[PDB]
Amino acid sequence: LPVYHKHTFIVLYVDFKPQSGGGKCFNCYPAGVNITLANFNETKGPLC
Amino acid sequence: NNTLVSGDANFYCFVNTTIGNETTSAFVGALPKTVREFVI
Amino acid sequence: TKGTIYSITPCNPPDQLVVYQQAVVGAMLSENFTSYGFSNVVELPKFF
């Protein structure tokens, strides 16, 4: 049905970037850390 | 009826809903060629 | 937009074929076309 589209973009930024992981461990989550998407609220009410 | 968004008081229909002192603009999108009945 | 309407026919309706002496011969179809290597498509009541 034609309705003038108003968009919403949900995007997530996984940045695993470990220090190779072949010398000691890859599944040890090194520099695994922040993976997040801009939509989080300080109150952090669920974003619908 | 007219092309301009204001048009006359290519057909563009805008439905705008305002709550309290805030005014918002909405998009009609599809416009029927002919409507024979209306229900609410 | 206007009022035209369109039907949605399925792509591949089942076809009825015949076999005799361990080889295929003849075929009941729906389209006025020679799908297989058969050289004639005799139109007949209720089917081709």
Ligand SMILES: *[C@@H]1O[C@H](CO)[C@@H](O[C@@H]2O[C@H](CO)[C@@H](O)[C@H](O)[C@H]2NC(C)=O)[C@H](O)[C@H]1NC(C)=O
């Ligand atoms: C059905 O008829 C066709 C032609 O009317 C026959 O076709 C020949 O088949 C050979 C073997 O594949 C091909 O090398 C020729 O090029 C075909 N000729 C044409 C004109 O296509 C086919 O053999 C017949 N089959 C049966 C079971 O009757």
Ligand SMILES: *[C@@H]1O[C@H](CO)[C@@H](O)[C@H](O)[C@H]1NC(C)=O
């Ligand atoms: C997420 O983490 C990466 C690396 O830890 C960092 O570059 C980025 O600034 C962080 N925040 C966001 C919103 O991507």
Ligand SMILES: *[C@@H]1O[C@H](CO)[C@@H](O)[C@H](O)[C@H]1NC(C)=O
């Ligand atoms: C659409 O909303 C704007 C802003 O509130 C208003 O100026 C305009 O008159 C509205 N369009 C109508 C009522 O057709």
Ligand SMILES: *[C@@H]1O[C@H](CO)[C@@H](O)[C@H](O)[C@H]1NC(C)=O
């Ligand atoms: C069926 O195909 C034959 C092949 O020549 C053609 O002459 C005839 O007009 C066609 N009939 C229909 C209804 O498509």
